[PDB]
Ligand binder design. Structure first.
Ligand SMILES: Nc1ccn([C@@H]2O[C@H](COP(=O)(O)OP(=O)(O)OP(=O)(O)O)[C@@H](O)[C@H]2O)c(=O)n1
Ligand SMILES: Nc1ccn([C@@H]2O[C@H](COP(=O)(O)OP(=O)(O)OP(=O)(O)O)[C@@H](O)[C@H]2O)c(=O)n1
Ligand SMILES: [Mg+2]
Ligand SMILES: [Mg+2]
Lengths: 437, 437
RNA sequence: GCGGAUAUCCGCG
RNA sequence: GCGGAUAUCCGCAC
RNA sequence: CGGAUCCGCAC
RNA sequence: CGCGGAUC
């Protein structure tokens, strides 16, 4: 073991190299030179300004302060104007309010506009509370900016860093707040092992209490959950990972897992041995950002799942993959084929009228009474899950999320069996089916 | 073809002919003759006495009237003595107190001991009511015996005459009580179309009312429901027939529906086109009466159905058949085969102690978290409905009804597909599957 | 965009 | 029984 | 009191 | 499971 030998070991893996530091430190100096000239207000916030970023996650967040007496467009316009005319490379994003994401001296940079604001109960735009976070954090974070790095690394290598919808994990700000609250990666990790789905972590009041859900109170605004977009499953994965760390520590907790990657042959035989219907719904990925695509991929996956559920194909698990040009909604069902015939249900024997209407209909098999009710044998539209999803996708594309549903209306495909294993989804399947090596 | 004429022609199918009527009359006289000289008290009751018996169903009922100071042991002993000593050939059967069945001059007779009783207030056995039933109906039935005969014939033709557990229909008594209420067959049929599962027919008060469920109030003991063992499905089945009749009457309603009987090859094709799984449990028939066997057959049929439903084989319908020596429980299932793997479900993530226990267990696949709970993949014991039941019948003969389960304990089989259609159940499978001719 | 809550319409029953 | 659709208020993505 | 089923009650 | 009631 030797936990602190492992902690020191992990430091060199998580702390950015001298070349990196100065690399961004040279892009920071130049970025100032170009703004100071254009004369508007700015502050550096985030993982760079507080000196908390990871080794290899060098991005610079620069908010622009704007007068209280403005309008949404006068922000959107003046901000996006500055970005492109202050960075070498540039593009666009559509979050809360559209912002610039550029590259200066080879270093990625975000540029968000927001309101100046006196004290943070005005909450005019929600991104208005970001410089306040910096204010509250700097100096309170001093001497601990390595314990923050250690945590972010611990997460990043277990896919639960980032509060983006691609992840639903811990935001960088939440990592900083935890280290303030507990005072050390390790004190955070130990205590986490007893975190519950109803744990409230009031940083400003230095107390843990019971609540409605897992709430971390923002010390800048008390009615804001810093951990709001952390999924229940990911909190569950973190709590367990801490337990498993403490109980038997290792350095491997800080190294990302390399994918499974096995023969299209072995995978074929696992499905053969599980006896399940495993299939994917392929289509062209829409041209939108991650914060937009992923929540949709999730809805699409849920809606089809609930279909498989409803039509009694008894699905096991679902998964998705976004790739270069394609997307893949992946499913595993316990029922490969279902009987053509099924039960309809009619009116109670009493209801004289609906009964003559129910028995009027033309059918291959004579109806019958059961527990004072008419029932009838009818034929299903489709007989396998694949045939079912193929029908559902065509008729219910609109309900599978806006941008994704429209990309299905244009083109979609059901791929199953040995054909499936030829697509770039092998790791996402083994993950899903819970394959060990 | 004009209602009123059809009833006329139906009478011929329903009324005992010249020969049969005085076949029993000569038997009635020798029975009086043999009883009188034993100086014992008796009344003739039932179908014969009130002269409502159906064609080909000639049976004398004689209740012996013992003074109410005897003992459930004396009238029991004396009753058999007189019963044995008055019939040509005799059997003994047990229902209330054991009584004597047999023959007099080629006519089937029942000789039942019962207490005389002055009032229908102190009723200490079901058989004690019969004298009073007759005393109430006699004379109130005169002028209407053919109308009762019609009603019994209508029911008998559609397999819902008899209150015995084998049928769960309308008793002979109930039919008479209906004709006394509605005055005629037809006025019964007309008005029956508006019976509900809550209808209450108090004959003594000559009022129809709304209660808790279908309840025909015994005029002799108004706490008794004369319609007690009429099923809901046979109440419905009748209520529907009357409607179907009135609307378009025919003699056809009074003749029995001769069984389908189709090629063991066309039936093979149906199960194919339905894509269901059809099988039977076959076992040696226990040696007990029908009112013991059928209730159990129902229970056994239910428990195995419930199993298949619980186990996710999606059962469609069930039926049973009781031949001379063997019994057959029949099932149709929507799932011919389910996957080997299923999901198990463990503790919520927070439960340290129980997660450890749950995650140590040896498995072929990595368990996973979902909605804050550990779930794990596992292997099913059986994978087809046939295998499933074999497992279930072996382990759970206990539950499938006392006498029946004991025979299933002894020996049972599962016959399915090509092998099944060779058995004597062809007629019950079709009805269950609702196959038209 | 996604999720929740409130209000309202369409469909298979 | 559900399966969709539409508006307003809320919350999240930085 | 020979019997089996079904519903209510306390578990 | 066990008891009570109803049912044929
Ligand atoms: N889900 C989020 C993301 C961001 N922020 C605010 O925006 C700042 C910068 O955002 P971001 O780049 O996403 O996080 P960083 O703190 O910069 O950490 P990192 O860059 O390593 O992700 C945060 O410090 C915080 O004040 C927030 O409150 N909630
Ligand atoms: N559910 C029943 C069945 C029968 N009985 C009584 O038992 C008598 C005779 O029984 P049974 O021979 O079985 O029927 P029958 O009424 O004589 O006519 P059938 O045999 O044609 O049905 C009837 O008069 C009736 O009073 C009764 O009280 N309740
Ligand atoms: Mg940052
Ligand atoms: Mg009789």
């Amino acid at each position: 073991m030797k936990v602190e030998e492992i902690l020191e070991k992990a430091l060199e893996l998580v702390i950015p190299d001298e070349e990196e530091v100065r690399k961004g430190r040279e892009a920071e100096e130049e970025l100032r030179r170009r703004l100071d000239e254009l004369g508007v207000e700015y502050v550096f916030v985030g993982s760079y300004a507080r000196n908390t970023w990871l080794k290899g996650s060098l991005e610079i967040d620069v908010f622009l302060l704007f007068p209280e007496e403005f309008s949404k467009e006068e922000l959107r316009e003046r901000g996006l104007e500055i970005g492109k005319a202050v960075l070498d490379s540039y593009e666009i994003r559509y979050a809360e309010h559209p912002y610039v994401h550029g590259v200066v001296k080879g270093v990625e940079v975000d540029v968000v506009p927001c309101y100046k604001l006196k004290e943070p109960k005005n909450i005019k735009s929600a991104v208005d509370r970001t410089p306040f976070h910096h204010k509250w954090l700097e100096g309170r974070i001093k001497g601990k900016e390595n314990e923050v790095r250690l945590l972010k690394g611990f997460l990043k290598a277990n896919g639960i860093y980032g509060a983006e919808y691609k992840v639903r994990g811990f935001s960088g700000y939440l990592c900083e707040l935890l280290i303030v609250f507990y005072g050390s990666f390790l004190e955070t990790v130990k205590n986490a092992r007893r975190w519950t789905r109803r744990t409230v972590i009031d940083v400003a009041k230095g107390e843990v209490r019971k609540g409605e859900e897992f709430f971390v109170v923002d010390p800048v605004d008390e009615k804001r959950n810093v951990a709001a977009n952390l999924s229940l499953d990911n909190l569950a994965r973190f709590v367990h990972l801490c337990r498993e760390f403490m109980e038997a520590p290792s350095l491997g907790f800080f190294k990302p897992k390399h994918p499974l990657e096995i023969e299209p042959e072995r995978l074929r035989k696992i499905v053969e041995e599980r006896g399940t219907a495993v299939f994917a719904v392929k289509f062209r990925k829409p041209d939108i950002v991650d914060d937009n695509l992923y929540p949709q991929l999730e809805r699409a996956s849920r809606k089809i799942f609930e279909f498989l559920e409803r039509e009694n194909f008894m699905p096991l698990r679902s998964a998705f993959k976004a790739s270069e040009e394609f997307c893949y909604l992946l499913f595993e069902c316990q029922i490969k084929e279902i009987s053509r015939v099924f039960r309809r249900m009619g009116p109670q024997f009493e209801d004289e009228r609906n009964v003559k209407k129910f028995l009027s209909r033309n059918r291959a098999f004579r109806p019958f009474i059961e527990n004072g009710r008419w029932w009838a044998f009818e034929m299903r539209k489709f007989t396998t899950p694949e045939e079912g999803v193929r029908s559902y996708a065509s008729t219910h594309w609109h309900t599978l999320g806006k941008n994704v549903g429209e990309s299905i209306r244009e083109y979609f495909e059901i791929i199953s069996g040995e054909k499936l294993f030829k697509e770039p989804v092998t790791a996402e399947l083994c993950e899903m089916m819970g394959v060990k090596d």
